[PDB]
Amino acid sequence: KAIDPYNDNLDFINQITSAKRLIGDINRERVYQTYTHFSQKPKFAEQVNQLGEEDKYRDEATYVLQQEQAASRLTKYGIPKKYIMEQLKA
Amino acid sequence: GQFYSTLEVICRKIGAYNDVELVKLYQFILAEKVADSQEAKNRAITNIQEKIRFNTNLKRVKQPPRRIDQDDPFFSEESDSESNFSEPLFNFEDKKATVKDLVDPFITQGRKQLETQLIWAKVKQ
Amino acid sequence: MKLLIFLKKINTIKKIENLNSENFTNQNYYYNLTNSLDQSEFITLKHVTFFFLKNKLMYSLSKYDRLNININENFYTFLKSLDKVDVYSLKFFKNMIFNKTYSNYNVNLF
Amino acid sequence: XXXXXXXXXXXXXXXXXXXXXXXXXXXXXXXXXXXXXXXXXXXXXXXXXXXXXXXXXXXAAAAXXXXXXXXXXX
Amino acid sequence: SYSKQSSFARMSAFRNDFDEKIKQKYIKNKTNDER
Amino acid sequence: LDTTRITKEKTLTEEYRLSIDHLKNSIVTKKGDHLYDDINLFIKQISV
Amino acid sequence: MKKIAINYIFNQTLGRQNHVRVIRLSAPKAIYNFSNKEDILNGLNEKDYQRYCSQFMNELGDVLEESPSQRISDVQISDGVIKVTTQGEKTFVINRQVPNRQIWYSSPVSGPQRFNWDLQEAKWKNQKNEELSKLLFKEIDQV
Amino acid sequence: KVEENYYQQQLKEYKLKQKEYMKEQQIREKWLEESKEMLEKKFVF
Amino acid sequence: GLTFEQKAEIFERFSNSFVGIDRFKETQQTLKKIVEANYSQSAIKEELIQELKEVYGKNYEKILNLRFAVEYDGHKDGVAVGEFELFPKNLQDVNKFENYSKNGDLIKQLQQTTYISVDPKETHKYVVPKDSHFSLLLDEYIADEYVSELNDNQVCLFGFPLTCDESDITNLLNNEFKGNFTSSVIGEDILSLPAYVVLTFSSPKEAAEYKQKVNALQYTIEKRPIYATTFEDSRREHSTNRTLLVTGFKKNEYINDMLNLFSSFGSVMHFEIVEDPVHSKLPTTEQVIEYLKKTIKEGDDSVIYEITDFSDGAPSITEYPPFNPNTELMRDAKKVHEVKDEIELEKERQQQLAKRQLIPRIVLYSWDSESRVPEEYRMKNASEEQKKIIQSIENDLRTQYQNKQYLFVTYACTQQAQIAFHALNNLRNYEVTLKKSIEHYHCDTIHQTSVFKE
Amino acid sequence: VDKLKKYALRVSDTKRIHDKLKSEEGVDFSYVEPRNLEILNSFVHRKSEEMEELISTYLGVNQTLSKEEQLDDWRQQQALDHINFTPETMGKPEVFYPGSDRGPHPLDDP
């Protein structure tokens, strides 16, 4: 809930980019035994390519890799009402 | 050979995908331009259409034979597989297509919409 | 008073937008575009008989929906603005985005 | 009906077939390629393009925007 | 035929299972013997 | 075999020109216009 | 005026359509023929008819459903009717005709005809003294 | 009964892939080996 | 042949143009009449009345003003009543079926339903389990067959077109046919018009000899034939050779046009269309979660129930059954065999998350605005002046529907069916077959997709 | 024509950007000299290069040519290396594939 990609404030964003330049990089797979939307999980994906070959997994793996390999606020998370109405005044 | 190659540059920017399509679109606009009253106009189209129906048959390549996919009453034709990857030039490691390459960034499609989409493709195969 | 009628209604409108609708889930406006033009809708011997015989209103009246017409107007002008304007350029850019164009500088094994 | 059976092959059906290939394949850009085109509904001669269209929008407009445009040298 | 609705109706062919060992029954008469 | 082969009777060398003139009269042409260059060449590539 | 029958029907599970609306229009029947229930006809009362048909009519559905033979491509059953389709396209139909106190048989081989009940013999039979069943099983082998 | 049938129905599909898969590798080995021999002759001369 | 100028009109109308744009401009101006008329029919009566006269002849006056009664058998408690008009005065009010008067609320109680709000006992009457399909619940239709129902001494006629009145029939019998019959009765079809008449003769020789008269002479109303039948023709004039399918039509088409089509080719005796709604409710996540916990047992992870929230327009997901990541781990290992045990187990734990995500998920929808919205612009915080307005609108939105792209017919004749089978195969996109022992669930698609997921 | 440029600038603007987010000069790579670099890439792609020698000998390809023919190989690399996507660097103007009857893809009519 907290990480809203459509959130656009200097506070919420400068706290992010300033973190990575100082921290470096993270392997967040140790952290999350459940699923997240914002995280990168290559080892998670390299699996599903192999399981994806079977019959069950083609119809279901596609939505996963669409959800991962995508790069957009828009196509991935849709477009909520607020982000549009901001652009009429702008 | 002098004025042929320029038409291919002109006709495309016009609707005419080929040279003869110009004639097919400008049949009647051009038929009025010729006078050889109404019987001359009616006989003028026959002077034109018979040319068209002769110009084609020479340009018409002998079509390949009838495939399985064509004229299938119950189902449409097959949709060729589109992929995002280019195989190695030599496959020492035998690479294969995978689910990631079928996907395209910057285009998405709802979860339910796919399973509907994929079933009716599975029924074709 | 005119300002009140303007703004008192808007108090309702902001509360009317939040109704339930299964249609708002799907992207109907995108489906209607794609599903309009099909292989079927191309003129044939069969359609043409329907346009001579029973072009009438009692046999056919659903043509006059605002949504079935406003959507076809986009396809309408594209066909008739074909000869007069450089829409062939638009075709070139449309292929250019997905690299379906084929240039000279680039390298090929074709 | 006989005329339709006569001028069948002579009929022009290439332009319509082109758009079908557009909507089918590139379903995304096709919406943009068609949206790009939008001819003007009504013309207008003399005016002051600076703010005449500005006031022409604020007043004397009903469900139809007004604006300037170029022409064959005009 | 190409219609998605009419197609599967035209495709179906019922009584998809059959056998050969099983005799085809008949209505029985307790009136008289046959042999 | 000769039934297939062309003859000067059935050609269209003039009917092209009649249509192109209908375009020039119907369409505006300028140096900036992409059609102006090719058509004025096309006219020479018949009359020459 | 005539009448339309609308039947809102709903699904109990989750994934499928919550709501459905069925439409059914059916013009009424004309009453050309009529015969009271107590009025016996062709040697049967209204109740004598429903028994001696259903006893013979229900046994067939027990068979033809269970028919292992290839020839019977399709079979359908409804209230007092049964349809048959031999291999290919042809059709045999049996149908109860109430006011006649008789049944209606129809074959492609032999045209539409009727059969009557016999008490001393206790079986639907023809003018030719022939069962309905054996004609059904013979005409199939005939074709 | 069915799982035993479908077990052995599907072995035939598996082995035939496996056999033709190994036929390539046997043909690879001769290419891999012999091609290496042609190198050493050219660099020793 | 034809003149020159007619060809160009045919050419321009059919030169790189599909259906929707054939004479595209003229259709716009028809709206400019209607919209300015505010959907009042006033701009159109002068045109239709010409068409009815050329088609329906005399009865056009009725046929503007015909009305079918309606009966809603959905709600468990009571059946409702209503009416429906051909060619009404409000061009908006078309195939809406909203004039019902008797029981006004009960149908709103059904249109205003989620996939949760199902009480089979008190509210709802018909319900579809998984084992079955909604067609099986209905009383299975049996078309009435007239030639099989005869006395072998009476005769029936066929092929009376739309323009013929009852007065016309009584004249033709006394004038042309001049029967020696004892009695005669007319059979009215769906519309009030007649299509077939039975004639009783005292003995069979009177019938057949009278029959061959009627079929020797070829009496032909405007273009269609008329003939006679006896018990022999019960084979050919059976329901199998009457019924038909249709599938080529679009979603948006009205019934008011359909009934005129299939009545033109010949008289009709039965219709069936299945229509589905567009807009339906979308309840909250909690009402779903309160519901699923009653239905579903624990330890059933074969299927997962996604739930989504569109009160912002963009989906936000809530899942059920949630995930149990309960695990123990080996930590601070100092020996070799300690490591080996970790490897064999983590081959799964390198895969648990994917095998969770790669489960077939039933998609479900939800709204949830009242939570994520300011308190001012909520429904609870509204006035009774407003709360009537919104319920007025909700009750309107959920009256739109969509046909399921198929149809059924029973033509009382066979020659009429031959002719409809001949033309409909040659019109826009329609595709037709007889109905040889098939039901709705074959042509249904949406039900036919959900079953394949199972 | 005015919109054609807005619609055209988006094309070149996007291909720049989409390749940028995949390239990312700042974080993902760094520009280095190519000469000293290929020493490294000879090690990680070592497996491919080993087999390419076996293929050259299997075909019967000859050894390196004389200095003069190596100097001929020099400038032919320089020609391929001194590109700027201009007719000055090419020797030819820029063109695009003639969209053919069987299809715009070239192999439809090789």
I407 touches I272 (CB < 8 A): yes
CA distance I286 to G18: 18
CB atoms F34 and C84 under 8 Å = no
I381-I387-I390-I391 Cα dihedral, nearest 10 degrees: 130
User: Judged by CB atoms within 8 Å, which residues 44-63 of D form the interface with J?
Assistant: none
Question: Could you tell me how far CA J5 lies from the centroid of its own chain?
Answer: 28
Tell me if chain C has a CB within 8 Å of the CB of I21: yes
Q: Which sign, positive or negative, has the C-alpha torsion J2, J5, J8, J13?
A: negative
Measured between alpha carbons, how far is residue J36 from residues C63, D61, J28, J39, J41 in Å? 71, 69, 19, 6, 10
Does residue C94 belong to the interface with chain D, where contact is any CB pair within 8 Å?
A: yes
Chain B adjacent subunits, 3+ CB pairs under 8 A: A, C, D, E, F, I, J
- What are the chain I neighbours of C74 within 8 Å (beta carbons)? none
**Chain CA centroid to CA I127, Å:** 19
Burial class (CB in 10 A: 0-12, 13-18, 19+), I160: buried
Distance, in Å, from the CA atom of C81 to the CA atom of C93, rounded to the nearest integer, reads 17
Which residue, I89, A36, J99, G28, is CA-closest to D18? J99
> Which subunits sit against E, judged by 3+ Cβ pairs under 8 A?
B, G, I
CB J11 within 8 A of CB C96: yes
Core vs surface per residue I307-326: b (16+ CB within 10 A) or e: bbbbbbbbbbebeebeeeee
Give Cβ neighbours of residue J8 (< 8 Å, ≥ 6 apart): C89, C93
Find the DSSP H helices in G1-143.
46-64, 132-142
| Euclidean distance between CA atoms A39 and A26, whole angstroms | 10
Contact flag B90-J99 (C-beta cutoff 8 Å): no
C93/J104 Cβ within 8 A: no
B90 vs chain I: nearest CA distance in angstroms? 32
Measured distance CA(F16)–CA(J24) in Å, rounded: 54
CA-based nearest residue to I264, from C60, D60, C30: C60
CA distance I223 to I228: 17
Question: Chains contacting I with at least 3 CB pairs below 8 Å?
Answer: A, B, C, D, E, G
The Cβ of residue J3 has, within 10 Å, a number of other Cβ atoms equal to 11
Residue E32 to residues B38, E28, E29, E35, I258, Cα–Cα distance (Å): 91, 10, 7, 10, 60
Chain I contacts in chain C segment 79-98 (CB below 8 A): 79
DSSP element (H, E) containing G73: strand G72-77
Please provide the distance, in angstroms rounded to a whole number, between the alpha carbons at the two ends of chain F.
Answer: 33
| CB contact D35 to I (< 8 Å) | no
Q: Distance between alpha carbon D17 and the CA centroid of its chain, in Å?
A: 19
**Shortest alpha-carbon distance between residue I195 and chain A (Å):** 55
Q: B17 to chain D: which residues are within 8 Å by CB? A: 14, 18
Residues of I in contact with E10 (CB under 8 A): 433
Write the DSSP symbol of residue I177: I
For chains F and H, having 3+ Cβ pairs within 8 Å is answered: no
Instruction: Name the H helices within I2-129.
Output: 4-13, 24-37, 45-55, 60-64, 104-111
Q: Is G121 an interface residue toward E (CB < 8 Å)?
A: no
J7 and chain D in contact, CB less than 8 A: yes
Nearest to I55 by CA among B96, C54, G80: C54
- Nearest alpha-carbon partner for I241 in I408, I415, I406: I415
Nearest beta carbon to residue D28 from set B18, B27, B107? B107
The shortest CB-CB distance from D4 to any of C45, C94, C97 is to C45
Nearest to I255, CA basis, from A69, G23, G70, B15: G23
- Containing G84, the helix (H) or strand (E) segment is strand G81-86
Q: Using alpha carbons only, give the angle F26, F27, F33 rounded to the nearest 5 degrees.
A: 165
Q: Which residues pair with G13 in a beta bridge?
A: none
For residue J63, the chain H residues in CB contact (below 8 A) are 42
Shortest alpha-carbon distance between residue D8 and chain I (Å): 10
I vs H contact (3+ beta-carbon pairs below 8 A): no
Strand partners, C29: none
CA distance J101 to J98: 10
G26–I269: do the CB atoms touch at under 8 Å? Answer: yes
Please report where in the chains the tokens 């037709």 appear, as a residue.
Answer: I432
Contact state of C90 with J4 under an 8 Å Cβ cutoff: yes
I267: exposed, middle or buried (C-beta count within 10 Å: 0-12, 13-18, 19+)?
buried
- C90 burial type by CB count under 10 A (0-12 exposed, 13-18 middle, 19+ buried): buried
Chain H residues whose CB is inside 8 A of the J50 CB are none
- Buried (b) or exposed (e) across C16-26, using 16+ Cβ within 10 A? eebbbbbebbe
Please indicate whether chains J and I are in contact, defined as at least 3 beta carbon pairs under 8 Å: no
Is G93 strand, coil or helix? strand
Tell me if D36 and J3 make a contact (CB, 8 A cut-off). yes
Nearest to I408 by CA among I420, I426, I396: I420
Residue I161, phi-psi category: left (phi > 0), alpha (psi -120 to 50), beta (remainder): beta
Q: Are strands I361-366 and I304-309 parallel, antiparallel or unpaired?
A: parallel
- The helix/strand/coil state of I401 is strand
Tell which of B115, B117, B125 to mutate to test the I interface (max I CBs under 10 Å): B115
By Cβ distance, the residue of B18, B90, B92 closest to J101 is B18
- CA–CA dist I154, I202 (Å, integer): 8
User: Is residue I321 reached through a cis peptide bond, with omega within 30 degrees of 0 on the bond before it?
Assistant: yes
D13 inside 8 A of chain I by CB: yes
Residue D2 CB contacts under 8 Å (≥ 6 apart), including other chains: none
Contact assignment for J53 to H32 by CB distance below 8 Å: no
Inter-CA distances, I92 with C61, C63, I33, I37, Å: 12, 13, 14, 11
**Measuring CA to CA, which residue among I167, I144, I147, I142 is closest to residue I158?**
I147
DSSP run (H or E) holding H3: helix H2-44
Residue appearing with tokens 């809406």:
I96
Residue I407: its H or E element:
strand I407-411
Return the bridge partners of I185, or none: I198
Task: Give the length of chain G.
Answer: 143
Resolution expressed in Å = 3.7
Could you please report the per-residue DSSP string of I235-247?
Answer: TTTSGGGT-EEE-
Helix A55-69, helix A42-51: angle, nearest 10: 150
Instruction: Using an 8 Å CB-CB cutoff, list chain G residues near I274.
Output: 20-23
Return the number of CB contacts < 8 Å for E and I.
33
Alpha-carbon distance of G122 to G78, in angstroms, equals: 24
The candidate with the shortest Cα–Cα distance to I427, out of I274, I254, I262, is I262
Choose the closest CB to D16 out of I2, I6, I18. I18
| Integer Cα distance of I406 and I246 in angstroms | 6
Closest among H21, J6, G122, J91 to E27, alpha carbons compared:
G122
d(CA F34, CA I362): 56
The distance of C104 to chain J (nearest Cα, Å) reads 6
Strands I127-128 and G3-11, how do they pair? parallel
I354 touches chain A (CB under 8 A): yes
Binding partners of C (≥3 Cβ pairs within 8 A): B, D, F, I, J
Contact at 8 Å (CB) between G69 and G137?
A: no
Alpha carbon I111 to its chain's center: 16
Chain J contact for C81, CB < 8 A? no
Dist. CA B125–CA I36, nearest whole Å: 53
Partners of E6 on chain I (C-beta within 8 Å) are 245, 247, 406, 431, 433, 443
